[PDB]
Amino acid sequence: ERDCRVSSFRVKENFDKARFSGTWYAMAKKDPEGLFLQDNIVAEFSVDETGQMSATAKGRVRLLNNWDVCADMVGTFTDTEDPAKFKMKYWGVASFLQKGNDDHWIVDTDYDTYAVQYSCRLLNLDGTCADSYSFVFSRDPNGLPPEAQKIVRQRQEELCLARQYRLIVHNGYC
Numbered sequence: 001e002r003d004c005r006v007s008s009f010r011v012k013e014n015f016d017k018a019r020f021s022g023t024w025y026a027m028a029k030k031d032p033e034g035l036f037l038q039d040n041i042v043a044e045f046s047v048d049e050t051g052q053m054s055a056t057a058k059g060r061v062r063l064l065n066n067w068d069v070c071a072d073m074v075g076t077f078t079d080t081e082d083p084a085k086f087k088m089k090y091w092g093v094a095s096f097l098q099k100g101n102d103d104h105w106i107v108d109t110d111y112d113t114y115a116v117q118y119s120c121r122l123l124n125l126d127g128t129c130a131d132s133y134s135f136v137f138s139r140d141p142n143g144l145p146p147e148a149q150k151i152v153r154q155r156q157e158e159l160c161l162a163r164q165y166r167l168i169v170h171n172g173y174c
């Protein structure tokens with residue numbers, strides 16, 4: 001039926017770092033194992049003179065089963081040969097927060113309304129993803145317009161993830 005090989009997934013043709021910069025409100029997320037970013041997630045993308053993309057993220061994060069905190073995260077992106085695929089190094093401004101290095105794919109965007117991101121953290125031996133996450137972002141924290149929503153659904157389906165998202169609240173907790 002559908003091809004769910006990570007290698008088969010389309011990403012944003014000619015991705016434009018500069019156009020993507022600024023403020024992106026996460027509207028929905030598909031969680032990986034051991035989820036971190038919980039809600040109230042707001043991303044701020046930047047590009048420096050050298051053409052390097054970086055970001056910060058603020059939101060409520062899951063520390064222990066028991067509890068969740070407001071945290072500021074930071075990330076920097078290394079280029080690959082595909083201009084929409086990156087390696088993202090990340091850490092928390094607080095030393096004890098999750099840090100790591102994940103693949104960071106801009107699956108689709110129109111720069112001024114919606115973005116779909118995707119990371120496969122671990123492949124299955126059949127090329128399908130064993131452990132993935134995905135954010136759907138909006139420029140407007142009150143949500144996407146219908147045309148954008150519909151494009152986003154199709155991309156979520158193309159990732160083999162359309163059943164597996166939850167909504168992200170923005171209720172001023174942070």
Ligand SMILES: CC\C=C/C=C/C=C\CCCCCCCCCC(=O)O
Nearest residue numbers: 035036037043055056057074075090
């Ligand atoms: C893709 C993660 C959020 C969008 C990118 C935003 C900002 C640049 C990155 C800042 C640091 C990334 C924090 C990563 C933890 C992700 C997985 C999870 O929430 O469970």
Ligand SMILES: [Cl-]
Nearest residue numbers: 005007126127
């Ligand atoms: Cl493959």
